[model samples]
Target: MTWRRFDVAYHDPDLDRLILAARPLLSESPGRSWFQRHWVRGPHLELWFDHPEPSWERVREVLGTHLRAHPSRTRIDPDRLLPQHRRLALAEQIDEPLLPFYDDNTLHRAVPRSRVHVLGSAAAEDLFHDFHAAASTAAFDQLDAVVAGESRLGLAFELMIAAAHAHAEGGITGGFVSFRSHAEAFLAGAAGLRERWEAEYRTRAEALRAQVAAVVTGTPRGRAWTGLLDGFAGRGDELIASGALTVEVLRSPSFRRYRLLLNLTYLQMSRLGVTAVQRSLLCHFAASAVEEEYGVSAEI
Candidate 1:
């Protein structure tokens, strides 16, 4: 079945706050929902609905219901429909803070990616379930793809999950980067911020290598993945047997340099913003990725 995308544009004063309200309504519009994907932003809220085009009218009814409640909050411009976002980054569609990775929340504590906490939740985790769920669902799409086969973003997601797993084995200096401070530093173009993260990651990478080695070398499916680093020549038979993991997937620039791919994931997680909410969100998403890659849940 073809997935149909329908987008509606809204210019709202309380865009941030109202998005929280409108999202669940539009996304979970009660019915035999065809597993809809809501890709929203301030001026554009797009929903991918499979089944048929007019099935969109149900979404319109829910949308109108909300608009009627807060007539002052939202305005949909019929003439300004947005084009379907093709090949959009997951973060663009679900632009919420990845709190699980930053926050000292449930998943953050429980995930194999947390070397810091004792495994738990509450405080901020309760406050931001919405953010975590959305981020995980956005992340889940690629995770699902990686499990099925042939996802351009699969390697990145794989690394993201592994990086989180690596981080859990130990704590880092100071902590993950502060979202507010990093944003502030970013505006000023401070090289120090990223440099610090890069340095710490290098420091952490030493211990991480052996840990990652255990994971990849423990199985035939992964033993040759190291070819990305050591060269595939000697591992030809094993690499060829790992058929689903085609050369194209492994050779993509995404993981051209094994260590570099590790750095990218670590760096992205480092700057994801250290907070209960941000930490929790990212951890949850990474855990979702782990399930796809390892065929086991990382959650405690």
Candidate 2:
């Protein structure tokens, strides 16, 4: 698939500290839409937007006055910018002494596209468990039978499982952009797997798990970005896959829901990248999702 990054310099105090807020606009009404239009497709078509163009521009200009490429304008069409250029442009725009790529919207967007993939989940969980069950009995012969029969579909399912892990971990702590970086890194590393079967899938999941834990702990020491729910040794992968995983019940319904969620998820994540306020907002929602699910909160 083809992907692109559009970089903008912007800031807001009351709008929450969200940078790169995505607002989805229809083919006919792309401008009137709020910054909630972009979506995060499973490892594919992940688009992030920075909205309220005028305010974003002023923020960029304030921070960018010293640089030669002070981003006089912003563009969203993917065809115009390259990933490396995107990173460089963003790096020059931010005050790194105060923030890292974790805070730089452009750098965050510039990550190589390899860290994206798309697949189904439930079927994969069924297979991963089945594989475990077979291994328990030393059913190497039977294992091969299962692998041979469901090989192609199994791999796809495995990828979805990886995506779900990334999604949950990214949203768990609400660190926003940092968790996003962790997810992107997970996808990029996993996509490079030369192995055709489970090895590649397992490696991706393990890598994401590692990153998510590092971020959640805040004492990453030397570790890289990971998701929020990453610290627990024996976390609930089964329940995670079941609850967070997005499935298209019907082709059309799934498609619409997937599109809507993608736009909202990325838009929210984008805000997290831009400001601490956005981070707090995201964390609040993340917390609320849990409380809401358990009926612990009186207000919805």
Candidate 3:
């Protein structure tokens, strides 16, 4: 019935050790649970919880009761919080996961996803969490945008990144030398998928062209969306130059569409008997897509 907030420096010397110990408690219940938004990127971690009572038991349990006593700004209004927080609060109240597909368009316009399925899928198939830990926090956009399709050129770039991944033969390598050679080798080995991918991508290039136009010509939501991207970036580069996943992007609806697409495609691939290797390749493709779209430095 109420919302509560808490503050702490992410760099509090005791935080690292305390977080791991407190992680288990965070999952025990929704009322007992907390959602974190990294307000100052690395240093200021704000925790929010929606519950009946005012005091934050988890803060005391995890950080310190003294922290709750020190800060005066911790307060809550259910409507003022993000959908992520609302979702957690509602789920906690109901004591069950809310099925997102049943949700109407209005809510979708806000957060755009329930995140239950994609998040669960990410926990399973997202192999290289070491690099993805921060990037994974990034959200997604709408289903229309998600299904609008990556362009052929985008597909080529994705495969090129995958080639680098294949060449390195390791989990998380972004930039590499001899990209042309690596692409050739990757083509030779992944010819089946490569050929099929090329053909399929061609069909979507036209749709992608329209999407690009929408983003450029200020049609429909492009201006507002760009405003958000520019607003967050402050530099107004639309975050293309940062290459870092900060808290602002993670909490936004724009970023979620891509990650939702990644999880949705991964789930579809799995249902069709796709191999872990192919799935991993798709993940690398997603990594490239994210890097290009959000300027996340690297996600693989």
Tell me the whole-model lDDT of each prediction, alpha carbons only: 0.33, 0.29, 0.34
Candidate 2: RMSD to truth: 21.0
lDDT of 2 by residue, 1-300 (tens): 122333333221212212122221111121221222122210111222223333434434533442223322222433333354446545544312222212223322333222111223544333323222222222222233344464322222222222233443233332232323434443455543313323433445544344434433343211211222133112233323454333422344323332323333333333222233333322333233333333343231
- The lDDT leader among the candidates is 3
TM-score of 2: 0.22
Candidate 1 weakest lDDT stretch, 10 residues: 103-112
For each candidate, how many residue pairs have backbone atoms clashing (under 3 Å)? 25, 23, 7
**Model 3, range 25-100, lDDT digits (tens) per residue?**
4444445334332322122333444453334554555455334434323333323434554465565342322332
Name the regions of candidate 1 deviating beyond 4 angstroms: 13-42, 71-163, 166-188, 191-300
Mark the regions of model 3 whose C-alpha exceeds 4 Å error after superposition: 1-189, 235-300
Each candidate structure's TM-score, on Cα atoms with residue i matched to residue i, is 0.29, 0.22, 0.25
Which has the better TM-score: candidate 1, or candidate 3?
A: 1
Model 3: number of backbone collisions: 7
Best by TM-score: 1
Q: Residue-wise lDDT of candidate 1 within 200-249, one digit each (tens)?
A: 44564534334334443343323222223223222322333443222313
Question: Which pairs of residues collide in candidate 3?
Answer: 139-255, 139-256, 140-255, 140-256, 140-257, 141-256, 141-257
